Amino acid sequence: SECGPLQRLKVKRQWAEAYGSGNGREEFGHFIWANVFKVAPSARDMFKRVRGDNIYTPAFRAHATRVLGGLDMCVALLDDESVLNTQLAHLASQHSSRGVSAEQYNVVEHAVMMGVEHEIGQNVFDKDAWQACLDVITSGIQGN
Amino acid sequence: SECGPLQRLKVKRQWAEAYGSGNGREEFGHFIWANVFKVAPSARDMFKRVRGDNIYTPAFRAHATRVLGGLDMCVALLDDESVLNTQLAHLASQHSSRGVSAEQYNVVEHAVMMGVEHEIGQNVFDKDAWQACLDVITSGIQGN
Amino acid sequence: DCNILQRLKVKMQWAKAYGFGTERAKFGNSLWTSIFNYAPDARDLFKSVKSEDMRSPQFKAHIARVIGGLDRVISMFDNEDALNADLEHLKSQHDPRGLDALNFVVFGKALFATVGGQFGVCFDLPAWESCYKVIAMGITGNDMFS
Amino acid sequence: DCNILQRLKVKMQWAKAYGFGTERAKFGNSLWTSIFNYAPDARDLFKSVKSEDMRSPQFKAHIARVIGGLDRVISMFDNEDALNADLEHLKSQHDPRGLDALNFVVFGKALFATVGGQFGVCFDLPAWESCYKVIAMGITGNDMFS
Amino acid sequence: DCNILQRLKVKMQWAKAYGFGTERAKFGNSLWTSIFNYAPDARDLFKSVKSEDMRSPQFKAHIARVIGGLDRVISMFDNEDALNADLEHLKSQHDPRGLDALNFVVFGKALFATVGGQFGVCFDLPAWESCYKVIAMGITGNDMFS
Amino acid sequence: SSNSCTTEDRREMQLMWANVWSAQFTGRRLAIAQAVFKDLFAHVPDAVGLFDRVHGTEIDSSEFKAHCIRVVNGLDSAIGLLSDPSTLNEQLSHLATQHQERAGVTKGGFSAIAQSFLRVMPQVASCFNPDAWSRCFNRITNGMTEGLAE
Amino acid sequence: FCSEADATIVIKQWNQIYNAGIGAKSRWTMGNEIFSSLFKLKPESEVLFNNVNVANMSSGAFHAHTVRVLSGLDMGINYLNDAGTLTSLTAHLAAQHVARTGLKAVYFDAMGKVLMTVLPSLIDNFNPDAWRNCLLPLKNAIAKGLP
Amino acid sequence: FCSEADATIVIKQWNQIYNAGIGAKSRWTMGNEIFSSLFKLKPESEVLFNNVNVANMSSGAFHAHTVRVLSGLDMGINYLNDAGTLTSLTAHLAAQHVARTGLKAVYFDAMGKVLMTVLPSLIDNFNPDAWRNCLLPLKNAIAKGLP
Amino acid sequence: FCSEADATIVIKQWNQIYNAGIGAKSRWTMGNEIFSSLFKLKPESEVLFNNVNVANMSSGAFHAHTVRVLSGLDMGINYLNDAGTLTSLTAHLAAQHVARTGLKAVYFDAMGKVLMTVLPSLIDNFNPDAWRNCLLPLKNAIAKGLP
Ligand SMILES: *[C@@H]1O[C@H](CO[C@@H]2O[C@@H](C)[C@@H](O)[C@@H](O)[C@@H]2O)[C@@H](O[C@@H]2O[C@H](CO)[C@@H](O[C@H]3O[C@H](CO[C@H]4O[C@H](CO)[C@@H](O)[C@H](O)[C@@H]4O)[C@@H](O)[C@H](O[C@H]4O[C@H](CO)[C@@H](O)[C@H](O)[C@@H]4O)[C@@H]3O)[C@H](O)[C@H]2NC(C)=O)[C@H](O)[C@H]1NC(C)=O
Ligand SMILES: *[C@@H]1O[C@H](CO[C@@H]2O[C@@H](C)[C@@H](O)[C@@H](O)[C@@H]2O)[C@@H](O[C@@H]2O[C@H](CO)[C@@H](O[C@H]3O[C@H](CO[C@H]4O[C@H](CO)[C@@H](O)[C@H](O)[C@@H]4O)[C@@H](O)[C@H](O[C@H]4O[C@H](CO)[C@@H](O)[C@H](O)[C@@H]4O)[C@@H]3O)[C@H](O)[C@H]2NC(C)=O)[C@H](O)[C@H]1NC(C)=O
Ligand SMILES: *[C@@H]1O[C@H](CO[C@@H]2O[C@@H](C)[C@@H](O)[C@@H](O)[C@@H]2O)[C@@H](O[C@@H]2O[C@H](CO)[C@@H](O[C@H]3O[C@H](CO[C@H]4O[C@H](CO)[C@@H](O)[C@H](O)[C@@H]4O)[C@@H](O)[C@H](O[C@H]4O[C@H](CO)[C@@H](O)[C@H](O)[C@@H]4O)[C@@H]3O)[C@H](O)[C@H]2NC(C)=O)[C@H](O)[C@H]1NC(C)=O
Ligand code: HEM
Ligand code: HEM
Ligand code: HEM
Ligand code: HEM
Ligand code: HEM
Ligand code: HEM
Numbered sequence A, B: 001s002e003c004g005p006l007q008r009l010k011v012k013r014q015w016a017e018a019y020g021s022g023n024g025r026e027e028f029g030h031f032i033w034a035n036v037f038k039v040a041p042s043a044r045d046m047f048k049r050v051r052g053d054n055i056y057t058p059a060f061r062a063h064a065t066r067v068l069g070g071l072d073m074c075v076a077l078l079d080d081e082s083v084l085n086t087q088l089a090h091l092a093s094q095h096s097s098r099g100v101s102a103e104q105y106n107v108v109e110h111a112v113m114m115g116v117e118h119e120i121g122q123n124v125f126d127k128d129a130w131q132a133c134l135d136v137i138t139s140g141i142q143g144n
Numbered sequence C, D, E: 001d002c003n004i005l006q007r008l009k010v011k012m013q014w015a016k017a018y019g020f021g022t023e024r025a026k027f028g029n030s031l032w033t034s035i036f037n038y039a040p041d042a043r044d045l046f047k048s049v050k051s052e053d054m055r056s057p058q059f060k061a062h063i064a065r066v067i068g069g070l071d072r073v074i075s076m077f078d079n080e081d082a083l084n085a086d087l088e089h090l091k092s093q094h095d096p097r098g099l100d101a102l103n104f105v106v107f108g109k110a111l112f113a114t115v116g117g118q119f120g121v122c123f124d125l126p127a128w129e130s131c132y133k134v135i136a137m138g139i140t141g142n143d144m145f146s
Numbered sequence F: 001s002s003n004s005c006t007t008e009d010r011r012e013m014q015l016m017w018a019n020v021w022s023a024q025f026t027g028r029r030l031a032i033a034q035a036v037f038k039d040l041f042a043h044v045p046d047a048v049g050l051f052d053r054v055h056g057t058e059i060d061s062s063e064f065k066a067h068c069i070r071v072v073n074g075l076d077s078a079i080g081l082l083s084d085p086s087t088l089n090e091q092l093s094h095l096a097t098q099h100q101e102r103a104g105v106t107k108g109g110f111s112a113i114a115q116s117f118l119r120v121m122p123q124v125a126s127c128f129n130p131d132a133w134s135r136c137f138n139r140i141t142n143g144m145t146e147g148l149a150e
Numbered sequence G, H, I: 001f002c003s004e005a006d007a008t009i010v011i012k013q014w015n016q017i018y019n020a021g022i023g024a025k026s027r028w029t030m031g032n033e034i035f036s037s038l039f040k041l042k043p044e045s046e047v048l049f050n051n052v053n054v055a056n057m058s059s060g061a062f063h064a065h066t067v068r069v070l071s072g073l074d075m076g077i078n079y080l081n082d083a084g085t086l087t088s089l090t091a092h093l094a095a096q097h098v099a100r101t102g103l104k105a106v107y108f109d110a111m112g113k114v115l116m117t118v119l120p121s122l123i124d125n126f127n128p129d130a131w132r133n134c135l136l137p138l139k140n141a142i143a144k145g146l147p
């Protein structure tokens, strides 16, 4: 499937519903990262500086906050290729010296999808739209 | 991390919240043992006498009741090293002729933590405090 | 005036004040009631849509079309290209009717009263006066709205 | 022009929007928050009443004096002699502070948003713009209120 | 008397009766109201904390300190070492005031009335009389509380 | 009074912000930041230089826009966490290290932009409470500039 | 000032005869009866109002005076349950009197008796005790510093 | 027209992706997808829009066209429960398409298929029956008479 | 002092780990951790407690000391919303530390850091801002005047 104009609108609305204004953001990010580290416990070693060993700590919670803030910017820009690709390049450089594998990117993708579904319900979750647009996002954070 | 005086107080309060007075105890113990046997299906063979094949049976429910009653005593005594270590020795002898591996002990630890978190919520769950004090508990049930 | 900040402000308040479903027809009935009250003569200008009876479907359809116009215009407040192109469209529809521009001043007043009353005390009147002008100008061409 | 009919409509709408008890303090706080949001720089002209903390007793006392003035002034709308005497009394208190008249324009805009926001959709903005001019003209003198 | 069972019983009931937050000041206001009612003369003994006016902050602070004292004492009911050490502390504070021991009998009565009324019908009066004695004795040294 | 950013000021600031905040499109955010920087620049000319990497001389370029979006994202993250200060402290330190050791980036410039926001918000936000806003905006910048020059 | 329960009675009783819906005429009508009563109890105080044309009490200048007076009393009453603001309000009011010379404390005591005599004729089932409890302190605060 | 319960669903689903709180960009983005699809189905109909600059679908003139098209659809939808006004609204809209050059009823049948194909991609749990019951009637009214 | 909403949070969090239904053991356990930490920060201040038997922190005399220290803190906290009484309560407490030998205001700054460091370990979602807004003011009152 492709992340077309329509899929970008769906993703924007469903992301806004899931992410919300902030009250459920902590629970939202916790669910996501609890999923990532369970599917890939090995990856937490890359988060030594933000206490990846304990995702319940303020330090990790701040990181999770930053990450979701990153996803938000990309979702918000999905309909502005120009500024979008500029933002993906910024995220790319923030991950360049850390050796993230296309496999770990996909992990976080699934984690993000489950968390969003968990927030808005399987009844409305559009898997095709999210996978396509998440591919577009990570693909860009990995340069290509 | 270490199971110090402060961590022992936190664990006591959070355990009291999760374990409660008894109404949610069945669901509490079921969640825990459903987790243990899924992470280590092999281990249920040690529970032949208490129907480990069916944790929905009264027999198993009684065992789960006993186990949590054991954890409760230890949590309650965390601030009384003297009587604590005496109780750990009793539990040690109740498991001596059964060949439990330090690996299975750790399993039950994680199972216990998830169940408590499940009961009080990730928002307040103190992973560091629980892991340290659970290490102290199982470590003692295994003699050392 | 009517920079980008006031345009976003006006879109926010219009969204809230305007509302969904049937509350739309109410807001419109009020807008048009204030207009004919502020300037009773303007009522004769709509005999083509049966202004003779404000509860009639012909005049309700007109009400719907006008607030529908206000809404699409306000929604394009951020894209000048589509905005002017549409204001130009609305202009070609009003020009052949020889409408006195002073009635667009009355319209705006009624509009502020209706949006302000429905939105509440945080209604931004200066932003509304400044951005309404843009709209009336695009429809009239009268520098009165400069 | 603010004829007698408009003065009456305005006295009626004010009464309803001003209310009783603490609703008045709320109306006042809204009026003044809107003034400082409409012209963020006017806030400096009130250091004498501690406008740094709008919820301080000094400023709240100032909010009450002002709406209290609006009230008595609006209640005298029907008696020219009493009205003009009090407006002069107010000008006397505002002159020694050399105030830019344009601020009084902002004040009026805020007054409309607050009253209309509290009164609702039947707010008669034209009547309010006209009659507020009489108060403004009477307090400042600036023929910009002519 | 006042074995370990009655000490735990008294801690239970005190916890319930005492309560959290602002209900604390109420319970205290009642305790002190009963005291001055049971023995009106004792009131003159607190001019240093403005007993002249029970709603005054100086006397509220005193009330807070006293129930705060009762609470910490009751909380140490299970550890004699800290209990006596603290009762000894409270003793050194009351000794230099030449207080008549009979007023501690009145205090206890007021205390039972206040705790019993707030806790209800399962109030354990015998346990309270027996364990209060321990407290009054540690503060007074009077064998009256033996 | 105290001037501290209270629980109620925080609730209000989240309201002032959540209402104006567009959770789907950059249109609103972007417009709010650009305007904040225009104001910052017009009051502090020398400040535009600090943004050459993000094309601060061209507020409408894809690069400055993306930067405005990041600033708006940092503020949003901080306004949300006013509710959970333990985590807020960790996030304000991170932001602090992201502005630290940057030639030209001082507390003076933060006070400046603070006034830029006070001039921008009322124009776009309805029911703006400048008092509660500044008390908490300052709570946030204080964490961001702990290790910066005056 | 006064208690919350006393303040409530006063506020409610005042609102009966004074509020945004009460026209100016009724207002200066109560005003004239009150100042006329004041002058009769303390004839010497009358001259203090030559600046508001006390000479002709049915003049625009004297009507506006009584109106702002009553408006000042209204403001004070409605803030009886906000001691912080009322304190600041009373201080300001006093400043506007102490600024004027000739005023004596006994003139405010007289005003007090005027109100206690006038209001029961305007207010439904007037409560002299609640009003005394709240007016007294209010009057003292405004006349603070007067000889 | 259509049931009151059907109308409720359509209104609810439509307001999900279209309401006064949505940016125009998304408005025309949905617009262009809708017409590009109509073109691919019936390419013969594209020329009809040469007047709104169909040549360049990213132009303000064309963006404005899709905008008013969608506002009309919105207007129609929000009145589903007011048979009287909607009848009048559709007749007007119907008049704005008759007077237009080169319009066959079959084009509104294609458009229908496009809406039934585009909407489900934007709307949560899109309901084709409820939408069919409410729009088909509308479409016949806006396309009643033409070729 | 501090906001009414801040006070509510502090009271709630504090009653989580301290209330009339908690055993004294835990009371002094928290007490010893608090002082041991104050000692490590400012070891020079330990001697000040030689009177309550600071030599042996497991003694009834010292346990009783931490107990009353905590009851005082509790007393202060539970009155956060009663400015009048709390002012009076702090002045008293303030008097009990002035008359004491060797007390510098900086010790109460250390204590503050200890509380901000110990509490989060005992309290669910401890709120440092709310606690800072409510205790800093209190600490200044109990430490206003000293070195
Ligand atoms: C206390 O004040 C009140 C109110 O006065 C007002 O307030 C003061 C502060 C001042 O600012 C005054 O300027 C202001 O009016 C006084 O009562 C008023 O007294 C006036 C008298 O000046 C009453 O009006 C009378 O005069 C008018 C106008 O007269 C002029 O115009 C006519 C032309 O039509 C000329 O012929 C005159 O030479 C003059 O230039 C007049 O229209 C009225 O008379 C009409 O009605 C009569 C029947 O009653 C007919 O016979 C007449 O032909 C004519 O049609 C008035 O006589 C004014 O109405 C009152 N105000 C009220 C509300 O009653 C009060 O006198 C003062 N106390 C004192 C003694 O100074
Ligand atoms: C259909 O219309 C679209 C949309 O354009 C709109 O509608 C038309 C009908 C007209 O009314 C337009 O006025 C209206 O905006 C057409 O696509 C747009 O076309 C413009 C072409 O001007 C695109 O603009 C690009 O270039 C501008 C300005 O370029 C000049 O100025 C810059 C200085 O800023 C110089 O450096 C250049 O040398 C040049 O002289 C500029 O805003 C952007 O360029 C920068 O940014 C790029 C990133 O986006 C960089 O890659 C560049 O290197 C440079 O830094 C614009 O890209 C405008 O963007 C497009 N719209 C889109 C969304 O792409 C379309 O062509 C038309 N169809 C036909 C064939 O007529
Ligand atoms: C700081 O104070 C603490 C706490 O003590 C308290 O405070 C002091 C200031 C004094 O006021 C004390 O009176 C008060 O309790 C000091 O630590 C405590 O010290 C006592 C020492 O007596 C510990 O008690 C151990 O021994 C007692 C009694 O021992 C005698 O009697 C038994 C018969 O029951 C005989 O068998 C012995 O030969 C002896 O003559 C007894 O209760 C316990 O001993 C049994 O239990 C142990 C397990 O806990 C076994 O391992 C033993 O083999 C035996 O069966 C006590 O252990 C008391 O427990 C400690 N407190 C703690 C919590 O450990 C501390 O020393 C002081 N600092 C200094 C240096 O002065
Ligand atoms: C799904 C897309 C992802 C987004 C939007 C994202 C976003 C972010 C953001 C905003 C930061 C903070 C950068 C800074 O301020 O320095 C960050 C840091 C980081 N990210 Fe990601 N990230 C994504 C995926 C991943 C993946 C798949 C991994 C690897 C398993 C990863 C590993 C890291 C690491 C190791 C850091 C540095 C943490 C630190 O500060 O010590 N990220 N990411
Ligand atoms: C987390 C700490 C643990 C506690 C507190 C605990 C507690 C208990 C208790 C109270 C009993 C009942 C003893 C009796 O009355 O005879 C029991 C039995 C038993 N436990 Fe545990 N246990 C723990 C961990 C484990 C682990 C890790 C395993 C192994 C996978 C295990 C295996 C058993 C077995 C096989 C029995 C005997 C069941 C029977 O009666 O047939 N326990 N445990
Ligand atoms: C800025 C505010 C206004 C907007 C947005 C607006 C919008 C519209 C719209 C959308 C139509 C329907 C066009 C069609 O589909 O045929 C319309 C029709 C019309 N408008 Fe306005 N209008 C505005 C102000 C006015 C004013 C102030 C007058 C004059 C007093 C006026 C007089 C008319 C008339 C006479 C019609 C034709 C009604 C008919 O179909 O018979 N409009 N307007
Ligand atoms: C037209 C509506 C207005 C009314 C009814 C009004 C009324 C009042 C009143 C009753 C006072 C208190 C006088 C006293 O007793 O000392 C006052 C004071 C004042 N007013 Fe106005 N005012 C109005 C508009 C304005 C405007 C637009 C400004 C300018 C920004 C302004 C600036 C001031 C200042 C600076 C003071 C003095 C504050 C002090 O230090 O006490 N007023 N006004
Ligand atoms: C057993 C119950 C009682 C307890 C727990 C108790 C506790 C206390 C406490 C904690 C203080 C404050 C000490 C300080 O911080 O300086 C105090 C003060 C005082 N108590 Fe008691 N008390 C009790 C009974 C009494 C009785 C029966 C009297 C006498 C009639 C009394 C008379 C006083 C006086 C005069 C003060 C000093 C007040 C001041 O600061 O001026 N107390 N008490
Ligand atoms: C309190 C409001 C402010 C917020 C929320 C904020 C936020 C941010 C964020 C999120 C970044 C990007 C960090 C990254 O991804 O690496 C950033 C970068 C930066 N900020 Fe701020 N900032 C604020 C105020 C300021 C001020 C007042 C100055 C100074 C005059 C400043 C100067 C900079 C510079 C120079 C950069 C680097 C830009 C670049 O990427 O080249 N910021 N800020």
Ligand code: HEM
Pocket (backbone or CB within 6 Å): G045, G048, G049, G051, G052, G065, G068, G069, G070, G071, G072, G073, G093, G096, G097, G100, G103, G104, G107, G108, G111, G139, G142
């Ligand atoms: C307690 C009831 C009273 C209230 C609420 C009250 C209120 C007021 C107010 C609001 C003003 C106008 C202030 C300004 O805007 O500049 C005023 C002025 C004045 N008051 Fe009072 N007042 C009271 C009693 C008195 C009494 C008892 C006297 C003395 C006999 C008095 C003498 C004056 C004078 C001489 C003026 C100045 C009039 C002028 O501007 O020419 N007041 N009063």
Ligand code: HEM
Pocket (backbone or CB within 6 Å): H045, H048, H049, H051, H052, H068, H069, H070, H072, H073, H093, H096, H097, H100, H103, H107, H108, H111, H139, H142
């Ligand atoms: C049911 C969906 C449709 C709706 C809601 C709709 C609505 C509208 C509206 C509101 C206008 C602008 C009227 C004006 O202001 O003058 C319009 C114009 C037009 N429509 Fe439609 N329409 C629909 C389907 C179609 C279809 C299927 C065709 C055929 C190919 C079509 C062809 C046109 C043309 C040719 C114009 C005139 C464009 C111009 O100004 O040059 N419409 N339509």
Ligand code: HEM
Pocket (backbone or CB within 6 Å): I045, I048, I049, I051, I052, I068, I069, I070, I072, I073, I093, I096, I097, I100, I103, I107, I108, I111, I139, I142
């Ligand atoms: C804010 C936290 C603190 C609270 C709530 C507190 C409370 C108390 C209380 C209730 C007492 C007993 C008073 C009596 O009954 O006579 C006390 C005593 C004392 N406090 Fe504090 N205190 C605090 C901090 C400190 C600090 C930072 C120091 C300094 C090193 C200190 C030094 C003392 C000393 C030396 C005594 C006397 C001990 C004795 O009886 O020998 N306190 N404090």
Ligand SMILES: [Ca+2]
Pocket (backbone or CB within 6 Å): A105, A106, A109, A134, A135, A138
């Ligand atoms: Ca992928």
Ligand SMILES: [Ca+2]
Pocket (backbone or CB within 6 Å): B105, B106, B109, B134, B135, B138
């Ligand atoms: Ca372990």
